[PDB]
Amino acid sequence: MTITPQNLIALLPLLIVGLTVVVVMLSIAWRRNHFLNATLSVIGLNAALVSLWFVGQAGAMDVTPLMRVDGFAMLYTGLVLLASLATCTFAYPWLEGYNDNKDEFYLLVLIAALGGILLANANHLASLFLGIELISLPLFGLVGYAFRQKRSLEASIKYTILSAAASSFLLFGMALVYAQSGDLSFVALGKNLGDGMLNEPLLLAGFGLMIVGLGFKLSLVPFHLWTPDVYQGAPAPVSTFLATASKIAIFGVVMRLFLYAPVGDSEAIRVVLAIIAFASIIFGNLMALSQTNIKRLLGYSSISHLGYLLVALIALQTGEMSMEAVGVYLAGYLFSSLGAFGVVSLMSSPYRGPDADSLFSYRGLFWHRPILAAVMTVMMLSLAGIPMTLGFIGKFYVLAVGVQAHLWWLVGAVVVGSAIGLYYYLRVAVSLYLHAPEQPSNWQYSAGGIVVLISALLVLVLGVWPQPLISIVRLAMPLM
Amino acid sequence: TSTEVIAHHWAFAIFLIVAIGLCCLMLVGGWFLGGRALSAKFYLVAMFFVIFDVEALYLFAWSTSIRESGWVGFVEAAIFIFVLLAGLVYLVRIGALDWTP
Amino acid sequence: MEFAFYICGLIAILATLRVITHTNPVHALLYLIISLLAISGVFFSLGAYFAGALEIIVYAGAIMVLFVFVVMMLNLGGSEIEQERQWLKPQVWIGPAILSAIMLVVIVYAILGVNDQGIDGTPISAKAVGITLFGPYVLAVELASMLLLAGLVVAFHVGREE
Amino acid sequence: WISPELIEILLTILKAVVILLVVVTCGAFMSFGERRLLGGSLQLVADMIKMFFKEDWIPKFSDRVIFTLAPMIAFTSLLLAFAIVPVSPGWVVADLNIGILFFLMMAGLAVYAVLFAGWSSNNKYSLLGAMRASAQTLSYEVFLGLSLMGVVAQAGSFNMTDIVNSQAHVWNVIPQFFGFITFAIAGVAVCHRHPFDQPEAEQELADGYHIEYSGMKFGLFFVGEYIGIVTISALMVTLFFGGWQGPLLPPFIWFALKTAFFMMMFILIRASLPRPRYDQVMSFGWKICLPLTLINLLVTAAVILWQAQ
Amino acid sequence: MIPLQHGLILAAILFVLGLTGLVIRRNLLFMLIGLEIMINASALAFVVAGSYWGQTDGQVMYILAISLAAAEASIGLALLLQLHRRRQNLNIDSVSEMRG
Ligand SMILES: CCCCCCCCCCCCCCCCCC(=O)OC[C@H](COP(=O)(O)OCCN)OC(=O)CCCCCCCCCCCCCCCCC
Ligand SMILES: CCCCCCCCCCCCCCCCCC(=O)OC[C@H](COP(=O)(O)OCCN)OC(=O)CCCCCCCCCCCCCCCCC
Ligand SMILES: CCCCCCCCCCCCCCCCCC(=O)OC[C@H](COP(=O)(O)OCCN)OC(=O)CCCCCCCCCCCCCCCCC
Ligand SMILES: CCCCCCCCCCCCCCCCCCCC
Ligand SMILES: CCCCCCCCCCCCCCCCCCCC
Ligand SMILES: CCCCCCCCCCCCCCCCCCCC
Ligand SMILES: CCCCCCCCCCCCCCCCCCCC
C-alpha cells in the first residue's frame, strides 16, 4: 500500500539515519574532518533515539507490505542505536591513532545502524534479507578497516567469504519457502496448510537453509567457527559493534519471524533448534576454557550467550514470558559487551600503526588503570550470571522460561555452561588484580571512559533493582 | 499462439542463427583458405561502473512505469537519485574519480 | 518454450561444472558468462523477461567484466597452483563432492512430493516489476541504494592504490 | 505443402535475412566510404579476397579460444543489437517487449571484445591500452542506458514500435535534447569512434589492441565496427527522429535518409573534431554526462506527471 | 507446462555445484567465482518460484539478490587485490594467522 504521513512519522529513525548518512557523506566531500564527521554521526544517532520517542508518541502499524512498527521494533531499534553510539565513542580515539581516512568508519557505522533498525522493523522476507545485508557489508568494511594489518585483513576475508556463503544459503532458503508458500510475508509462511500438514518438506528445507544463514549470523553451532578469528582480528570498536548490534538485530528479527510464522510451532524445527542451542552453550563455554586472548574469549562468550537466548526462543510459542525474557537478557548482554569491549578498546586506543601489536595484556590493570579494572571486573561478573548484576537477571529469565516449557536438557545445559563460564570469567576477573612486571589526555577518551563507567553502574543498579527494566521491556510487546 | 508471434519467433531465430553462422563460417573460410609459411584506478572505475549500473537498473525499472506510479513514485525515485548523486559527488570530490592527481 | 528451458538448463549445468573444474581463470570466467547466458535463456523461457534482461545487462555485463578486469590486472600465469592442481587429486574433491551430493539428494527429495500445477510461462513484463518495485517495495529500493552506497565506500576504502 | 502460415513465416524469415544482408553490406560500404573520403564494390570484393586468402596467424604464446572469440564478439554484439530496430511497418526482425534493454545487453557484451583482445594479445602494452579502452567504454556505458531511459519514460514502454508510435507528432529530439546528446556521445564512445578512437596514444607504455590481429580477424573487427555504427545510427533514428515516420516519402525511404544522414555526420565528426586527453575524457564522462542523464530523467518524470489529467 | 520442481531442481544443482567449487578450490578468485554461482542459483530459484505463482515478487527478489551480489563482488575483488598487494600470493590457506 501507499505511505501515509502517519507511516512517515513512524519512519523517523530510518529516515534520520539515512539523512545522517547523506549529510556525513556530503561533509566528507566538502572537507575531510574527523571531529566534525564524528559529531555529525553521533548527533544523527541521538536524533534517531529522540525520533524513537516521537514514534512511540504515535501508534503501532504496518508501514509497508515490508515493515511493521511496534514496541518490539522500538526496543530493538533503541538497543541497536545505543550500540552504534557506543561504537562511535570508542572508535574516536582509535581513529585518532589512525593514518588514513577516518570518516568512512562513521559512514559505515551509520549504514550498519540503519540495517539494524531495518531488521528491527522487518515483517517480510525481503526486509529480513535486506537488513541482514545492510548489517553485513559495512561490517565487511569495518572489520578490515586496518587492512594493512595481517589479522584485520584475514578477519575481513574470512567474514566476507563466510557471510556471502551464509547469505546465499539464506536466500536459497527463502526461495524454497516462497516456492512452497505463495506469499513472502512473515505471517503467511505455512498458512495454506491444515490437518496437521504443517511439516511440508519443502517449507522445512527452506527454513533449514534460513536456519543455516541465521546461525552463521548469530554464531550458533555448527556455523560458529568464524567468531573468534573475526572478533580478534577486527578493531576493538568493530568488535564492540559486531558483538552487540549485529547479534541484537539479527536475533530480534529471528524472534519476530518465529513468532509470526505459523510454521514456528513445528516440532522438527523446535528439536533442531534445541540441538543447536545445546551445542552452542556447551561448545562456547568449553572452548573459552583455555583462552589467553580476551577477544577470542569474548567470542566464545558470545556463542554461549546466544545459545542461552536461543534456548529462550525455543519456548516462544509455548510460554508467554519469552519475549520479555529475551528483551531483559539482550539489554543486560548489550551493556555487558559494551563495557567489556569498551575497556578493551580504551586500552587499545590510540592506534599504534599496522606494525605494532594490539595485545591487551589485562594482567595487573588495576595498578595503573583502576577505574577500567573495576569496570571490567563488573562486566566479567555480569557475563557469568552472578547475582547483583543484570546478566544474572537475564540468566534467571532464561532459566524460568526453560523451566516453564519443560526443556530440561536445555536447563541442565545452561547450568553446566554457567559453571564453565564461572571458571573462565573469574579467571579473567582475578587476573585483572594481580601484579604485572611491565606493560589519553583528551576529552573523547574521557567520554569513552564515562560510557563504560555508566554501563557498569547501570549493570549493577539494574542487577540490584531490575523492576524498571522489566517494566520497560514488558510494554514493548509486538502485535498479537 | 498466433501466426504473427510464431512468425516473429522463427524470424528472430533465423536472424540469430544466420548471423552467428555467417561470422563463424567466414572465420572458417579465412582460416581454412590461403597457404602457410597494474594501476588500481582501473579497478576503481570498473567497480563504480558496476555499482552505478545496478542503480541504473533500478531507474530502468522505474522509467517504464512513471505514469502508473504517480507523484509518490517520483518522490521515491528522487530520493534514490539524490542518494546516487551524493555518492557521485563524494567520489568526485575525494579524488576517487580524478584520473590525474 | 519447454525445449528451450531444458536445453538452457543443461547448458548452464555443464558450463558451471566446467567452471568449478577448470584451472585457467579466463576460461573459467568465459564458461561462467556462458552459464549466465544460459540462465538468462531459462528466465526468458519462464516469462520473467526483466530478470533475463538484468542477467545479461548486469550479471554477465558488469560483474563478470569486473572479474575479468581483476584477472587481467593481477595477471595469473601459474602462480604455484596451476602447477599443483589439487582439485584433480581425489583426496581433495571426493569428500566435498560426496557432501554436496548428499545435500543435493536431500534438497531434491524435498522438492519432489510438492504440488505442482506447472509454470505457465506467461510473460511478467518489466512494467509490472517496476510497479511492484516502486509500489509495495519502496524501502527495499531506497535501502538497496543505501547498500550499494555502502559497497561503494568499502570497496573504495579497501581497493584504492595510494 | 501449401498453406499461408507457412507462407507468412517464410516471408518473415526472408524479411529478416534481407535486413541482415543490407546491414552488413551497408557496413562494408561505409568502411569504403570512410577509407575514400579521408569499381568501388570491386575494390571491396578484392579487399575481401585479400583478407580471405592471407594466412590467419595465431601467436604461439596466445590463447586460441579468446583470440578467436574477440572479433566474433566485436561483430555479433551490435550486429545482433540491430535486430530490434523497425525499418518499416511489418519489416521488423523481432518485436521484443524488452527492445532497448536487448540493445543494452548487446553493448555490455560488446565490451568483452576489447577485453578479450587485450588479454589474448600477449603483450603488456597492448594489455594496458586495451584496459584503458575498456575503462573508457565502461565509463560511457554507465550512462548510455539512462540517456535512453528518458525516451522510455516519454513513451512509457521498452518496445521499439511503441516508441516510434509515440514519435508520431513530435520527435523526441526536441524534448529530450540532453538525452539525445548524451546518447550520441555514449554511442560514439562504445563503438570506439573519434574523438575516443585510441586512448593509448597518451602514453607510450600502452599499445593498440587491434595490433597482432592480421587478415580476416582484423576484417571482422573492421566490419563489426562499422556495423556497430550502422545500428547506433539506426537506433538514434528510431529513438529520436521519428523512425520511419515522415510526411511525404515512403517510410523506408525516410528511415534510410535519416540513417544515411547520421552516417555522414559520424564520418564528419571523425574528420573534424580533434583529440582530447584521456583524463579529460574520464572527467567529462563521470562528472557531466551521468548527472545530466539523471537530471534529465527527473525533469522528464516531472513533465510527464504534470501533463497527466 | 514446465514443472516448478524441474526449475527448482536446476537451481539446486547450480547451488550445489557452486558450493562444491567454493570448497574444493584453494584459490581465492575461484572461491569468489563459486560464491557468484551460489548467489545466482539462489536468484534463479527465486525467479522460478515467482514465475510459478505468477507474482512480481520473484523478480524483485532477483533484483535485490543481484544488488547484493554486485556489492559483495566489489568487496571480494577489493580484498583479493589487497591480499595480492601485501602478499603477492592468492593463497587462502597460508594467511591463517588467528587459530584456536
Ligand atoms: C554427587 C553427585 C550429585 C550432585 C552433583 C552436584 C553438582 C554441583 C556441585 C559439584 C560441582 C563440581 C565441580 C568440579 C570442578 C570444580 C572446579 C575446579 O576444580 O576448578 C579448578 C580447575 C583448575 O585447576 P588446575 O587443574 O590446577 O588448573 C589447570 C588449568 N590450567 O579447573 C578446571 O580444571 C576447569 C574447570 C571448568 C569449570 C568447572 C567444571 C564444570 C563441570 C560441570 C559442573 C556441573 C556438574 C553437574 C553434575 C555432574 C554429575 C555429578
Ligand atoms: C540445439 C542443441 C544445442 C546446440 C548448441 C547450443 C545452441 C543454443 C541452445 C539454446 C538456445 C536456443 C534454444 C532453442 C530456442 C528455440 C525457440 C523456442 O523454443 O522458442 C520458444 C519460446 C518462445 O517464447 P514464448 O512466447 O514463451 O513461447 C510460447 C510459444 N507459443 O522461447 C522462449 O520463451 C525463450 C527461448 C529461450 C531464450 C532465448 C535464447 C537464449 C539463448 C542462450 C544461449 C546461451 C549460450 C549457448 C552457447 C552454446 C555454445 C557453447
Ligand atoms: C558461439 C556461440 C555462442 C552463443 C551464441 C548465442 C546462442 C543462441 C543462438 C540461437 C538462438 C535461437 C533462437 C532463440 C529464440 C528466439 C526467439 C525468442 O527469443 O523468443 C522469446 C521471446 C519472444 O518475445 P516476444 O515475441 O516479444 O513475446 C511473445 C510473448 N512470449 O524473446 C525473448 O525472450 C528475447 C530475449 C532473448 C534473446 C537472446 C539473444 C541471444 C543471446 C546470446 C548472445 C550471444 C552473443 C555472442 C557470444 C558472447 C560470448 C559467449
Ligand atoms: C559490587 C561490585 C563488585 C565488582 C567490583 C569490584 C571492584 C571495586 C573497586 C576496585 C577495588 C580493588 C581493590 C583491590 C585490592 C588488592 C590488594 C592486593 C594486595 C593485598
Ligand atoms: C557436556 C555437558 C553435558 C550437560 C548435560 C546436562 C543434562 C542435564 C540433565 C538432563 C535430564 C533430562 C531428563 C528428561 C526427562 C524427560 C521426561 C519426559 C516425560 C514425558
Ligand atoms: C498521488 C499524489 C500524491 C501527492 C503527494 C506526494 C508527496 C507526499 C508523500 C511522499 C511519500 C514519500 C515516501 C518516501 C519514503 C523514502 C524512504 C527512504 C528511506 C531511506
Ligand atoms: C542503412 C539502412 C539499413 C536498412 C536495413 C533494412 C532494409 C529493409 C528494406 C525493406 C524494403 C521494403 C520496405 C517496405 C516497402 C516500402 C518501400 C518500398 C520501396 C523500397
Grid cell locating B5 = 508471434
Residue the block writes with cell 559493534: A241
What is the C-alpha to C-alpha distance for residues E37 and B41, in angstroms, rounded to an integer? Answer: 27
Q: At what angle do helices E4-24 and E28-53 cross, to 10 degrees?
A: 170
Pocket test for ligand 5, best of A278, A283, A406, A416 (most atoms within 8 A of CB): A416
* HSE (side-chain half, CA atoms, 13 Å) at C79: 15
Is residue C119 helix, strand or coil? Answer: strand
Amino acid letter at C89?
Answer: K
CA torsion sign, A304 to A306 to A307 to A312? positive
Answer whether C touches A (≥3 Cβ pairs < 8 Å): yes
Atom of ligand 1 at shortest range from CA of A423: 38
Residue type for B7, please? A
- Type of residue numbered D21: L
User: From the CB of A292, is ligand 1 less than 6 Å away?
Assistant: no
Instruction: Supply D175's cell numbers.
Output: 524534448
Question: Which one, of E27, E72, E62, lies nearest residue E41 by Cα?
Answer: E62
Query: Which of B9, B15, B18, B23 has most ligand 3 atoms within 8 Å of its beta carbon, as the pocket-test mutant?
Result: B9
**Which residues of B touch chain A, with CB atoms under 8 Å apart?**
72, 82-83, 86-87, 89-90, 92-94
- Per the CB < 8 Å rule, is C157 touching A141? yes
- Letter string b/e over residues E51-89, b meaning 16 or more CB atoms within 10 A of that residue's CB: bbbebbbbbbbbbbbbbbbbbbbbbbbbbbbbbbeeeee
E27 pairs with which residues across the strands? E91
Resolution (A): 3.0
> Which residue, D33, D69, D44, D38, is CA-closest to D230?
D33
| Centre of ligand 7 from the C-alpha of residue D26, in Å | 12
User: How does DSSP classify residue C61?
Assistant: I
Chain D partners within 8 Å of C30 (Cβ): 65-66, 69
Contact A32 B83 (CB under 8 A): no
Q: Give the Cα separation of A235 and A232 in Å (integer).
A: 8
Are D194 and D274 in contact by the 8 Å Cβ rule? The answer is no
The CA distance from A253 to A246, in Å, is 11
Question: How far apart are the C-alpha atoms of A281 and C43, rounded to whole Å?
Answer: 44
Residue A97 C-alpha cell reads as: 591513532
- A417 burial (CB, 10 Å; 0-12 / 13-18 / 19+) is buried
- The CATH number that applies at residue E62 is 1.10.287.3510
| Domain around E24 | 4-87
- Whether residues B54 and E67 touch (CB distance < 8 A) is answered with yes
C-alpha cell belonging to residue C154: 568499502
Q: Rounded CA gap, E52 and E2, in Å?
A: 9
Which residues 6+ apart lie within 8 Å of C28 measured at CB?
Answer: C19, C22, E30, E33
Per the structure, the complete domain to which residue C63 belongs is given by 1-159
Distance E58 CA to ligand 3 centre (A): 22
Residue A410: CB within 6 Å of ligand 5? no
Backbone φ and ψ for D54, nearest 5 degrees, come out as -70, 150
The CA distance from D186 to D139, in Å, is 9
Show residues of chain C in contact with D104, CB under 8 Å: 53, 57, 61
Domain parsing of chain B, residue ranges: 3-94
Q: D51 and D218 in contact (C-beta within 8 Å)?
A: yes
Q: Using CA atoms, how far apart are residues E14 and A443, in angstroms rounded to an integer?
A: 55
Query: What cell does D244 get?
Result: 520511419
- Cβ <8 Å between C56 and D138: no
A191/A41 Cα distance (integer angstroms): 43
Q: Do C152 and B84 touch (CB under 8 A)?
A: no
Q: Give the span between the Cα atoms of A140 and C151, in whole angstroms.
A: 9
Specify the DSSP class assigned to residue A429. H
Select from D50, D162, D286, D292 the residue whose CB has the most chain B CBs within 10 Å, as the one to mutate to test that interface: D286
Which of the following CATH numbers is that of domain B3-94: 1.10.1060.10, 3.40.50.10090, 1.20.58.1610, 3.40.50.150? 1.20.58.1610
Task: Give the closest residue to D119 by CA, choosing from D109, D131, D127.
Answer: D127
Q: Do E81 and B47 touch (CB under 8 A)?
A: no
B68 touches ligand 6 (CB under 6 Å)? no
Phi-psi region of A243 (alpha: psi -120 to 50; beta: other; left: phi over 0): alpha
* AA identity, residue A437: P
Residue A64 in 3-state DSSP?
coil
Q: How far apart are CA A335 and CA A329, in angstroms?
A: 10
Q: Determine, for residues B94 and A2 on separate chains, whether the beta-carbon distance falls below 8 Å.
A: no
Read off the CATH number of the domain in which C55 is found: 1.20.120.1200
Closest ligand 1 atom, residue A420 Cα: 38
Buried b / exposed e along A426-460 (16+ C-beta atoms within 10 A): ebbbebbeeeeeeeeeeebbeebbebbbebbebbb
- Spacing, Cα D242 to ligand 6 middle (Å): 36
Q: Which residue type is seen at E36?
A: E
Query: Going along chain C, which residue ranges are E strands?
Result: none
Contact call for A148 and E46, based on CB within 8 A: no
For every residue of chain D, DSSP letters joined together read: ---HHHHHHHHHHHHHHHHHHHHHHHHHHHHHHHHHH--HHHHHHHHHHHHHHS-----TTS-HHHHHHHHHHHHHHHHHHGGG--SSTT--S---SSTHHHHHHHHHHHHHHHHHHHHHS--HHHHHHHHHHHHHHHHHHHHHHHHHHHHHHHHSSS-HHHHHHHTSSS-TTTTTHHHHHHHHHHHHHHTT-TTSS-GGGG-TT---SSTT--THHHHHHHHHHHHHHHHHHHHHHHHHS-TT--SSS-HHHHHHHHHHHHHHHHHHHHHSS-PPPHHHHHHHIIIIIHHHHHHHHHHHHHHHHHT--
Contact in structure between C161 and B40 (CB atoms under 8 Å): yes
Q: How much distance in Å is there from the Cα of A443 to the middle of ligand 5?
A: 53
Query: Which residue among B18, B30, B60 sits closest to D216, beta carbon to beta carbon?
Result: B30
Are the C-beta atoms of B64 and D152 separated by less than 8 Å? Answer: yes
Taking a C-beta distance cutoff of 8 angstroms, is the pair A52, A303 a contact? no
Q: From A167, A182, A146, select the one nearest A356 (Cα to Cα).
A: A146
Q: Which residue's CA is minimally distant from atom 15 of ligand 6?
A: B76
Q: Are A189 and A261 in contact (CB under 8 A)?
A: yes
The alpha carbon of residue E100 is apart from the nearest alpha carbon of chain C, in Å, by: 23
- B1 close to ligand 2 (CB < 6 Angstrom): yes
- C-alpha separations of A194 from A197, A199, A203, C28 in Å: 5, 10, 14, 48
Distance A330 CA to ligand 5 centre (A): 26
Cα separation, D28 vs A237, whole angstroms: 64
- Give the whole-angstrom CA distance, residue A163 versus residue A141: 13
Our count of domains for chain E comes to 1
Can you say how many angstroms the Cα of residue A452 is from the centroid of all Cα atoms in its chain?
17
Q: Which ligand is nearest to the CA of A435?
A: 4
Domain ranges of chain A: 1-480
Q: Is there an atom of ligand 5 within 6 Å of A412 CB?
A: yes
> Which atom of ligand 6 is the closest one to the Cα of C146?
20
How far, in Å, from the CA of B94 to the mean position of ligand 3?
Answer: 43
CB C149 within 8 A of CB A111: yes
Helix axes A150-180, E4-24, angle to 10 degrees: 170
Contacting residues of A for B78, CB less than 8 Å apart? none
Asked whether the bond before D175 is cis by omega within 30 degrees of 0, the reply is no
What sign has the CA pseudo-torsion D180, D182, D185, D189? Answer: negative
Question: Which listed ligand is nearest to A410 at the C-alpha?
Answer: 5
Q: Which chains touch A (3 or more CB pairs under 8 A)?
A: B, C, E
DSSP C59: I
Distance CA(D127)–CA(D112), nearest Å, equals 13
Identify whether the C-beta of residue A83 lies closer than 8 Å to the C-beta of residue A245: yes
| CB proximity list for A425: less than 8 A, separation 6 or greater | A301, A380, A381, A383, A384
Question: Cβ–Cβ contacts within 10 Å for residue D257, how many?
Answer: 12
**DSSP helix/strand/coil, C107:** helix
* Residue whose grid cell is 561533509: A27
Measured CA to CA, the distance from residue E4 to residue C129 in angstroms comes to 21
Spatial distance between the Cα atoms of A29 and A12, rounded to a whole number of angstroms: 25
Spacing of C-alpha C109 from chain mean position: 24
D69 touches chain C (CB under 8 A): yes
Cβ–ligand 3 contact at B13 (below 6 Å): yes
Instruction: Check the CA dihedral A423-A425-A429-A435 and report its sign.
Output: positive
The DSSP output letter for C48 is B
Rounded-to-integer distance, Cα E10 and Cα E41, Å: 8
Out of A2, A18, A29, the one facing B93 most closely (by C-beta) is A29
For the CA of A416, the nearest atom of ligand 5: 4
**Angle CA D249–D252–D256, to nearest 5:** 95
Between CA D185 and CA D96 the distance in angstroms is: 26
Closest Cα of chain E to A154: distance in Å?
7
User: Quick check: A283 and A221 in contact, CB under 8 A?
Assistant: yes
Physical contact, D and C (3 or more Cβ pairs within 8 A): yes
- Strands, DSSP E only, in C101-149? none
How many independent structural domains does chain C possess? 1
Q: Per the CB < 8 Å rule, is C65 touching D109? A: no
- Taking the alpha carbons at both ends of chain E, their separation in whole angstroms is 54
Q: Look at ligand 4, atom 11, and give the residue with the nearest C-alpha.
A: A374
- Give the torsion sign (CA, C128, C133, C135, C137): positive
CA distance B53 to chain E (A): 10
Q: Where are the alpha helices (DSSP H) in chain B?
A: 3-32, 41-63, 66-93
The DSSP bridge partners found for residue D72 are none
Which of E14, E56, E58 lies at the smallest CB-CB distance from C13? E14
Q: Which amino acid is at C146?
A: M
Question: For residues D121 and D212, is the Cβ–Cβ distance under 8 A?
Answer: yes
- Between helix C126-133 and helix B66-93 the angle, nearest 10°, is 70
Mutate-to-test residue for ligand 6 from B66, B76, B80, B83, highest number of ligand atoms within 8 A of CB: B76
